Design a protein around this nucleic acid. Structure first.
Ligand SMILES: [Mg+2]
Ligand SMILES: [Mg+2]
Ligand SMILES: [Mg+2]
Ligand SMILES: [Mg+2]
Ligand SMILES: [Mg+2]
Ligand SMILES: [Mg+2]
Ligand SMILES: [Mg+2]
Ligand SMILES: [Mg+2]
Ligand SMILES: [Mg+2]
Ligand SMILES: [Zn+2]
Ligand SMILES: [Zn+2]
Ligand SMILES: [Zn+2]
Lengths: 128, 142, 81, 100, 80, 97, 99, 196
RNA sequence: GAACGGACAACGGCCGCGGGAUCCGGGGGCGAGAGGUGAAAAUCGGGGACCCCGCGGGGACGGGCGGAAGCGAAGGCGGCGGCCGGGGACGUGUCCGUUGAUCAAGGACGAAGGCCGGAGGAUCAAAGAUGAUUAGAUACCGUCGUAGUUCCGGCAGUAAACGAUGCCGACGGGGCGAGGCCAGGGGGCUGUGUCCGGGAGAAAUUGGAGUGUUUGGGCUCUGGGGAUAGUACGGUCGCAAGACAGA
C-alpha cells in the first residue's frame, strides 16, 4: 500500500461529464478527459458510455504519470442549477476504479448555496 | 373581542362572592388609608397601590378592609390625580412610542400602534370629559 | 388665508422654471431656510449663514455642515462612529 | 415595555413634585456657595466650563453628587418642569424620591 | 346529571368563571423561615418577591401562576 | 368548485410564503405548494458496491450517502410522477408508503 | 468652507488653514499629528486610520498638505492597508481606487 | 511534457498519526525562490480518517492545510481549517427537530484569529422542536464554550480538540440542563488572520 | 380600557457581525474543446477556454432545519448578536366602572409591476437584438441585453389583496393533532389544523355556509337576467400610468 494519492474531480452536468484528475493539492492537474472528447455527437457527451471512455483515458494517464490511488469528489453543476450529479457520474467512478485506481474517501462536493441568486428560466419556468 | 385587535382573551381577576373582612390584617381601617395615601404621594399609581396592598399586606381588596375604593380614598383626601391612571398610562405609552419614532421614523409598525394608542386615549378622554373627571378643554401634550 | 394649496415656499417662483424643478427645489428651500436646534444651547436658532456654515444666532455656536441642511448623510455617518 | 420605571426619569420628577428644587445656573452657584444643595443634575448640553465649576464646587462641599443627564436641555424639560428647557437642577431636598 | 346541582368533581375541572358561582383558585398564606421567628404573609399568585426582613432570605418568587416558594419554607393556608 | 380543502398548498394562518424555484422546470412555486421529495441514497450506486470493496484503501469503508431535497412544481411533479394519479376519494390520502 | 485652526504653544501662535469638515465647529480641539485619535476633524497618517473610515484632504505624496477630496461633500474611503510596503489603497470620490 | 515535474511531499505538525499525508508536484525550477512562488500558496484538505488511519468513526472531519515553507522536497504545511464532511453536515440535520447553529470569532493564546462554527440538534425528550428562547439560551452557552476552550489554548492544542471533538461534547454537557441536544458538532473552522 | 407577573414571539425600526452561491478580475496547472439543446446553431476556445486551486472585488440572497408550525390589522415576516419599540394569549382579591359594538365622511397602512429624485448594479430579465423551431412564429427553446430587480426619500394605491366567506355577540357533537400560558386530577383558558356526525345546502360541500316560512341580535357594504361595461360623460385624486366612482 505504497500508492500515491490524487484527487479525481468528476463533474457530471447534464451536458457533459469531466473526469479530471489532479494531485492532492488540486493546483497541479495530472490528467483531465471529458466525455465530449470521446464521442462526436453533442447529445452523447453526458452519456455513461462517454463517461466510461473518459474515465478509461483518465485512469490510464494517471497511472503512467505516477498517480496510483485517488480521492473522488463527485460534482454536479450546483449553485442555482442542478445539484444532482448527472448521468455519467456513476459510470465515471465505476470505470475509474475498474482500471487500476484504488479509491479512498469519495465525496459529494457540489457548490451548494446558502440561498443563492436568481436562477435562469423566468417565473413561469422553462416551458417545454 | 379586544378593542383594537382580534384576540378574545378572557384572563380577568374574579372577585370573591362575599367581601370578607380580613382577620389576618393587624392594622386598623385608618391605618390602611394612611398607608394608601402615603404610597400615592410616594409616586405609585392606584393599580400599583392595590397590588402592593395584596402582595405585601395581604389586603386583597381595600374594599374589604375599608369599604372604599382606592380612587374613593384619594378623592376623599384630595389626592385624586389631575389625569386618571388609565389615561396617564396611555399618555406615557403614546409619549414613549413617539420618542422612539423621533429617531426611528421608518417604523411603520410603530406609527400604526401610535394611532391605536391615541385612539384609545381620545376614547378615554371623551368619557372622562363626559363624567366631569377631566376638563372639557383637556389636550394631550404634543 | 393659506394663499397657496400645493407650492408653498416655491410660490415665489411663480409659474416659471417648470413644475418638477419647482417641486425639486421646494424640499431644499424648506431645508436651507429653516431654523434648527442648536446642539450647544438647545434652542431652535441655528440658521445658515453661507453654504456650508451653520450658526446658532442665540449662543453664537457656529459649525461647518452641509450645503442646505446642517447635516448630510455622509456627514452624519462619519460623526456617529 | 413595562409601563413604569425606577430610574432617573422617574425619581427626578418625583423629587420636583415632592421636594424643594431650583432650576438654573445662577441658582446653582448661589446654593453651592451656601452649602444648601444635596444633588445636582445637569444636561449634557450644559456648557462644560460652567459644568466644571459645579463639579468643582460640589467636590468642595461634602461631595455633592453631580449627574450628567443623558440628553439635552430640551430633554430635561421632558420631565415635570415643562414651561422651559432646563440646564441644571439643584435639589435642595427630595421629599419622596431615593435620589440621595 | 343536574345543572342546578353541580358535583364537586366537575367544579374544580371547569373554569373559575364558568362555574355556577365564580370561585377563586387563589388564597393567602403564611411563610415560615427557619432562622426567623416571624411569619411573613403573602398572596398565593403573588407578583412580588417576599423576603423575611431579619435573617434575610427570599421566601417566594413570582411566576406565571402560583408563586414558587424558595428554599425551606413551611406554608399554611389562611382560609376562614 | 373548490377541488381541495387546503387549496393545494399547506398554507394556513399565513398571508405569504416565499417562492422557491422548481428543480426541474425553474418555475416559481411557493414553498408550501411545492412537491418536496427528500431522497437519501448512497453516492456509489448499489451495482458498483462490490467494485468499491476491491478498490478501497480502507478496511470497512462506509460508502457515503447523497442528500438532496427534490422540490418540484405541480406541473412537473405529475410529469416526473413524483405524485401519483389517484381517485377523488383517493385525493384525501396523506400518508406516504 | 475653510477651517481656521489656531495652534498655541509656549513659543508662538501658529495659524493653520484646512478645508472645513462636516462636523467642525468653532472652539473644537483638533489634533494634527501622526497617531492622534481618529475623531472627526483630526489629521493623521493613513496607517493609523482604520479601514472604511471616510477621510478628506488626503495627501497624494507624504507631507504634501492634502490634495484629494477637497471640494464639497467629498470624502475618501480608506479601503485597505498593505502594512508591508507601507501602502494604503483608498477610494476616491470618482470611484477610482488609488494606491 | 510531464517529466519536467518533480514531486514534493507534504508535512503537517505532529498532532495527528500521519506526518506526511500525500505528495504534491510542480515543474523543475532553477531557483529556490521560484519554487516558493509556485508552492507556498498551495493548500490541501485531508480527511481525519486519513490522518488517524485506525479509527473510522472519527472520519467525519477533513482538515485543511496550507503550506508555509519548503526545505528540500518537503513542504511544511500548517493548519488552514477544518470542515465537516458533506456526508456529515447533511446527515446531522433531521427534520422535525430544531437545528441550532452558532459561530464565534476568537483568537487563540497565539495570535490565530479563528471562526469556529458549531451546530447541534435537539433530541427526543412527536416533533422535537425547541422554543426559540431556549435556542438563544444554548447559543449563548455555545459562545462561552468556544471562547473558553480555544482562547485558553494555543492552536496546536485547538486542532487536537477539533480532532477529538472536545468542543462538541462540551456543548452537549453544558446545554443538557436546558435542552436535550444531540449531534453537537463543530461544523467548520476557518483561519482569518495569522500572527505574522 | 389600564396595571402587574413569569413566559412566549420569522412583530417592526436600526446598528454591527457573518454565510455560502452566481458573476467578474487576476495568478497557477492542464491541453482541446467547452457551452447549449428534443436536435443543433449562435458563443468562447493554442491569444490556452472548459475544468482544478488560491487570491481579490462587488451586489444580491438566507438553502438544509422549514412543518397544514409561529407572529402581524392586512400587505407581510426566516442567518446571528445587540439596541429601541410593539404585540397577543395566560395568570391575578391590581385599578377604572360602562368607558362599548359597528360605520357615511375623514385618516393611516397597503405585494408585484410602475413613477420621481439620489445611490448602486452580481444574478435574472420586460423592451430590444439574435440562433433555432415552424406552413408562418412578431411566441414557446438557446444566447445576449436595457428598463427593472437592490437600497434611501417620496408618489402611486392595484391583485385570484382569496377562506373568492364583513365586524361584534349568544348558543351548539365526538375523535386526533405538533401552539402558548396555567394547573397538576387523560385539567382549564386561548389559538390552530384535521376527521366523523348533527344541522344546513341546488349540490360540491360546510363548526358555520348551523340554531331560517317554527322566517326578527346589532351595524356596515354589495347584488337584482345576459351583453353593452367596470366602458362613456361629469367629478375627485395622480408627475404620469391610471385610480376611485359609475351609466
Ligand atoms: Mg372597533
Ligand atoms: Mg375581558
Ligand atoms: Mg396574499
Ligand atoms: Mg489561466
Ligand atoms: Mg411596491
Ligand atoms: Mg419597484
Ligand atoms: Mg430610479
Ligand atoms: Mg442572460
Ligand atoms: Mg373621466
Ligand atoms: Zn445655540
Ligand atoms: Zn427569617
Ligand atoms: Zn417543475
Amino acid at each position: 500500500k505504497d500508492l500515491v494519492f490524487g484527487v479525481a474531480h468528476i463533474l457530471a452536468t447534464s451536458n457533459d461529464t469531466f473526469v479530471h484528475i489532479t494531485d492532492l493539492t488540486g493546483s497541479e492537474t495530472v490528467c483531465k478527459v471529458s466525455g465530449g472528447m470521446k464521442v462526436k455527437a453533442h447529445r452523447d457527451e453526458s452519456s455513461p458510455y462517454a463517461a466510461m471512455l473518459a474515465a478509461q483515458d483518465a485512469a490510464q494517464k494517471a497511472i503512467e504519470r505516477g498517480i496510483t490511488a485517488v480521492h473522488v469528489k463527485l460534482r454536479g453543476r450546483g449553485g442555482v442549477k442542478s445539484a444532482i450529479p448527472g448521468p455519467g457520474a456513476q459510470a465515471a467512478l465505476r470505470a475509474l476504479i475498474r482500471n487500476g485506481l484504488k479509491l479512498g474517501r469519495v465525496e459529494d462536493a457540489t457548490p451548494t448555496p446558502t440561498d443563492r441568486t436568481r436562477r435562469k428560466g423566468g417565473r413561469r419556468g422553462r416551458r417545454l | 373581542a379586544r378593542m383594537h385587535s382580534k384576540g378574545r382573551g378572557v384572563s380577568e381577576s374574579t372577585v370573591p362572592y362575599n367581601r370578607v373582612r380580613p382577620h389576618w390584617v393587624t392594622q386598623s381601617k385608618d391605618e390602611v388609608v394612611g398607608t394608601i395615601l402615603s404610597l400615592s404621594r410616594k409616586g405609585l399609581k392606584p393599580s400599583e397601590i392595590g397590588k402592593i396592598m395584596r402582595d405585601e399586606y395581604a389586603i386583597g381588596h381595600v374594599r374589604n378592609v375599608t369599604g372604599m375604593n382606592i380612587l374613593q380614598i384619594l378623592r376623599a383626601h384630595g389626592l385624586a390625580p389631575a389625569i386618571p391612571e388609565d389615561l396617564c398610562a396611555l399618555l406615557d405609552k403614546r409619549a414613549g412610542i413617539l420618542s422612539h419614532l423621533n429617531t426611528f421614523r421608518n417604523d411603520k409598525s410603530a406609527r400604526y400602534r401610535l394611532n391605536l394608542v391615541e385612539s384609545r386615549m381620545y376614547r378615554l378622554a371623551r368619557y372622562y370629559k363626559r363624567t366631569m373627571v377631566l376638563p372639557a378643554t383637556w389636550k394631550p401634550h404634543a | 388665508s393659506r394663499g397657496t394649496k400645493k407650492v408653498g415656499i416655491v410660490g415665489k417662483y411663480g409659474v416659471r422654471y417648470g413644475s418638477s424643478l419647482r417641486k425639486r427645489i421646494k424640499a431644499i428651500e424648506i431645508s436651507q431656510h429653516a431654523k434648527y436646534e442648536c446642539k450647544a444651547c438647545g434652542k431652535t436658532s441655528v440658521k445658515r449663514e453661507v453654504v456650508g456654515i451653520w450658526k446658532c444666532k442665540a449662543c453664537a455656536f457656529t459649525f461647518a455642515g452641509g450645503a442646505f441642511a446642517p447635516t448630510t448623510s455622509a456627514g452624519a455617518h462619519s460623526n456617529s462612529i | 415595555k413595562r409601563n413604569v420605571t425606577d430610574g432617573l426619569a422617574f425619581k427626578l420628577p418625583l423629587a420636583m413634585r415632592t421636594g424643594v428644587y431650583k432650576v438654573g445656573y445662577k441658582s446653582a452657584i448661589k446654593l453651592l456657595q451656601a452649602g444648601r444643595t444635596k444633588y445636582i443634575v445637569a444636561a449634557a448640553n450644559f456648557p462644560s466650563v460652567k459644568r466644571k465649576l459645579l463639579e468643582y464646587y460640589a467636590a468642595l462641599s461634602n461631595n455633592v453628587p453631580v449627574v450628567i443627564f443623558k440628553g439635552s436641555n430640551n430633554e430635561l424639560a421632558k420631565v415635570c418642569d415643562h414651561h422651559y428647557r432646563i440646564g441644571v437642577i439643584s435639589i435642595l431636598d427630595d421629599g419622596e424620591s431615593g435620589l440621595i | 346529571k343536574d345543572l342546578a346541582f353541580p358535583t364537586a368533581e366537575e367544579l374544580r375541572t371547569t373554569c373559575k368563571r364558568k362555574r355556577l358561582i365564580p370561585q377563586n383558585n387563589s388564597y393567602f398564606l403564611y411563610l415560615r423561615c427557619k432562622s426567623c421567628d416571624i411569619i411573613i404573609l403573602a398572596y398565593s399568585h403573588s407578583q412580588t418577591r417576599r423576603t423575611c426582613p431579619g435573617c434575610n432570605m427570599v421566601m417566594l418568587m413570582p411566576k406565571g401562576g402560583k408563586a414558587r416558594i424558595e428554599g425551606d419554607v413551611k406554608i399554611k393556608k389562611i382560609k376562614r | 368548485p373548490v377541488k381541495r380543502k387546503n387549496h393545494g398548498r399547506a398554507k394556513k394562518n399565513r398571508g405569504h410564503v416565499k417562492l422557491i424555484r422548481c428543480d426541474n422546470c425553474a418555475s416559481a412555486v411557493p414553498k408550501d405548494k411545492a412537491i418536496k421529495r427528500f431522497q437519501i441514497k448512497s453516492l456509489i450506486e448499489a451495482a458498483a458496491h462490490d467494485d468499491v470493496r476491491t478498490a478501497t484503501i480502507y478496511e470497512e469503508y462506509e460508502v457515503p450517502k447523497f442528500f438532496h431535497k427534490n422540490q418540484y412544481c405541480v406541473s412537473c411533479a405529475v410529469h416526473l410522477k413524483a405524485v401519483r394519479c389517484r381517485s377523488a376519494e383517493g385525493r384525501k390520502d396523506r400518508s406516504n408508503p | 468652507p475653510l477651517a481656521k485652526i489656531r495652534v498655541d504653544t509656549g513659543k508662538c501662535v501658529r495659524r493653520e488653514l484646512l478645508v472645513a469638515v462636516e462636523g467642525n465647529y468653532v472652539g473644537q480641539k483638533v489634533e494634527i499629528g501622526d497617531s492622534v485619535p481618529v475623531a472627526v476633524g483630526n489629521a493623521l497618517k493613513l496607517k493609523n486610520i482604520p479601514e472604511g473610515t471616510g477621510v478628506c484632504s488626503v495627501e497624494r505624496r507624504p507631507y504634501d498638505g492634502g490634495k484629494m477630496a477637497k471640494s464639497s461633500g467629498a470624502y475618501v474611503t480608506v479601503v485597505g492597508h498593505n502594512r508591508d510596503t507601507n501602502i494604503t489603497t483608498v477610494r476616491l470620490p470618482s470611484g477610482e481606487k488609488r494606491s | 511534457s510531464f517529466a519536467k515535474k518533480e514531486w514534493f511531499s507534504l508535512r503537517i505538525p505532529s498532532g495527528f498519526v500521519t506526518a506526511e499525508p500525500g505528495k504534491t508536484l510542480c515543474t523543475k525550477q532553477n531557483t529556490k525562490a521560484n519554487l516558493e512562488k509556485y508552492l507556498l500558496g498551495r493548500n490541501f484538505e485531508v480527511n481525519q480518517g486519513d490522518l488517524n488511519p485506525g479509527n473510522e468513526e472519527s472520519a467525519v472531519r477533513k482538515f485543511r492545510f496550507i503550506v508555509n515553507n519548503v526545505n528540500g522536497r518537503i513542504a511544511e504545511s500548517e493548519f488552514n481549517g477544518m470542515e465537516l464532511t458533506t456526508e456529515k453536515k447533511r446527515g446531522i440535520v433531521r427534520k422535525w427537530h430544531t437545528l441550532i447553529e452558532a459561530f464565534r470569532d476568537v483568537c487563540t493564546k497565539d495570535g490565530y484569529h479563528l471562526r469556529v462554527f458549531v451546530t447541534a440538534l435537539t433530541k427526543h425528550r412527536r416533533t422535537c422542536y425547541a422554543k426559540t428562547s431556549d435556542v438563544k439560551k444554548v447559543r449563548r452557552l455555545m459562545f462561552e464554550v468556544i471562547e473558553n476552550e480555544v482562547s485558553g489554548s494555543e492552536l496546536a492544542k485547538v486542532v487536537k480538540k477539533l480532532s477529538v471533538e472536545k468542543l462538541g461534547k462540551e456543548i452537549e454537557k453544558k446545554a443538557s440542563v436546558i435542552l436535550p441536544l444531540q449531534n453537537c458538532y463543530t461544523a467548520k473552522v476557518k483561519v482569518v488572520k495569522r500572527p505574522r
